[PDB]
Structure formats: C-alpha cells, structure tokens
C-alpha cells in the first residue's frame with residue numbers, strides 16, 4: 675500500500691532476528707508533511723524467511739489492541755521481493771533503553787502499570803491462539819510515559835487447532851535465558867512458556883536493566899562463566915531442573931518476586947494465566963496507591 679519511492683530513510687533503529695527496523699518518513703507529497711513510520715525488512719531474503727515474514731505480517735495485521743504495535747501496511751517495490759512491513763513509530767524506543775534511561779524517575783507503581791499493559795497484550799495474543807515466544811523488554815516499545823506496546827512478532831507462531839503447544843527448532847541462537855525448560859529440552863512453546871518468559875520480563879523490569887543483573891549475566895554466574903558452547907544450554911537445563919532461579923531484584927517486594935517464581939514453575943500446567951497475572955498486578959498496584 676506504500677510506494678517505496680516515498681519512503682525516505684531517516685536512520686536505523688535496530689537489527690534483529692535476520693531483520694532490521696528503520697525509522698523512515700512516508701512523504702508521497704514531497705513536502706515534508708508525511709508521517710514518520712517504522713519499516714521492518716529482512717537482511718538475507720531467503721524464501722523460508724520470506725514466508726515467515728509474510729506470516730508475521732498477517733499476524734500483526736490481525737491484531738488490534740492498545741498494547742500491540744499498530745500495523746500500517748506493506749511495501750513491495752520490485753516484483754514481490756524486498757517486502758517491507760510498515761508500522762507506527764513509537765518515539766521513546768524499547769522499554770529496555772527507556773527504563774534504563776529513566777530509572778531514577780520510574781517507581782514500582784509505574785513498573786506495575788507497564789506490567790499490567792504487557793499482561794493484557796499477552797492475553798489478547800492468547801485469545802488469538804498466538805504464541806509470542808520472544809517476550810523481552812528489548813521487544814517492548816514505549817509510546818509515551820503511560821503506554822507500552824508489544825512491538826515485534828518475528829518469532830510468533832499460531833497454535834495448531836488440535837494442540838496447545840507448538841514444537842519449533844530454529845537454526846540459530848535463541849534467547850535461552852528467557853525460555854521455559856520445556857522449550858529448552860523439547861522445543862515446546864505454548865501460552866505457559868510465554869508466562870515463564872513474562873516472569874523473566876518482570877524480573878528485567880525490577881532490575882531496571884542493571885546490566886550486571888541481566889538474566890544472562892545471573893544465569894552464567896550461577897552455572898559458571900567457564901562454560902561454553904552447547905554445555906551452557908545443558909547446564910542451564912540442569913539448573914532449572916534443580917529449581918535454580920534468578921534472584922529477587924534489589925528492592926523488589928516479596929509479592930512481585932512471588933509472581934515471578936510462580937511464573938517460573940517447572941510444571942507447565944501450574945503456571946498462572948495472564949488474566950490472573952493482570953488481576954494480581956492490578957490489586958498490588960491499587961494497594962500501593
């Protein structure tokens with residue numbers, strides 16, 4: 675729906691999983707009145723990545739929610755190659771960088787507001803039988819100080835109609851320190867593994883992205899920084915089987931860490947739902963104010 679002749683490159687916002695996002699200005703009138711948008715593109719346009727990317731586009735187009743980044747259109751250019759996804763531009767960047775920059779300004783009640791918005795977005799995804807699979811503060815964008823959005827769906831898969839999990843193995847590195855144990859061992863992804871990842875995201879938020887306190891740093895410290903290669907994965911698996919967990923962040927109340935640890939249940943069926951998580955976070959937020 676967008677003509678590439680009118681997409682004016684402004685800068686690069688980030689490089690992702692085989693793809694990159696650029697801040698551009700759509701200005702078809704050539705009068706500097708067009709709107710600034712985000713453009714996602716592939717870096718190596720293989721056919722597998724092209725099919726994955728169009729399924730991602732279809733997924734994002736099917737989503738309308740206050741906490742999901744808005745789809746705007748696509749841009750074909752030549753033939754059907756060089757496909758580009760057009761989305762709304764959110765001016766405050768990733769929740770990771772934003773929280774790091776304003777840590778002296780963001781108290782726990784604001785963190786819980788962000789947490790509730792994330793829970794509601796993830797529940798909306800679940801109603802569509804979508805498994806995000808990549809939930810992390812780097813993937814959460816900030817529209818303003820009062821609104822965050824889930825902002826990337828490059829790893830999102832649709833559940834089969836007859837099964838409540840999706841088994842996917844991927845040639846390439848994976849954010850294993852956000853993954854549920856069943857995802858590490860059997861490549862099984864579900865709403866419950868998304869709940870595990872959400873627990874990791876809550877941990878992130880309450881560490882205020884202190885880099886020493888990052889999940890990879892803490893996990894490598896727990897398993898020993900001497901480990902390398904596939905052994906790392908192996909040790910992580912073992913550490914999760916022995917109920918080794920990320921520590922309570924500094925200043926985090928015990929109820930928030932309890933939410934985290936309940937999300938970190940080894941038994942997939944004993945993990946809370948996103949609606950229960952939203953209810954508990956909203957009740958704690960109401961009690962604090």
Ligand SMILES: Cc1cnc(Nc2ccc(C(=O)NC3CCN(C)CC3)c(F)c2)nc1Nc1ccc(Cl)c(NS(=O)(=O)C(C)(C)C)c1
Nearest residue numbers: 687688689690691695712761762763764765767812813826
């Ligand atoms: C759709 C969208 C709408 N608005 C914005 N706003 C925005 C606005 C600003 C800065 C910015 O300033 N970035 C610099 C350089 C990179 N950071 C590491 C530090 C600061 C900025 F990154 C984003 N992003 C969007 N997407 C997006 C852009 C970059 C990245 Cl890294 C990501 N992360 S990700 O994991 O989900 C993906 C790369 C796999 C897609 C998402």
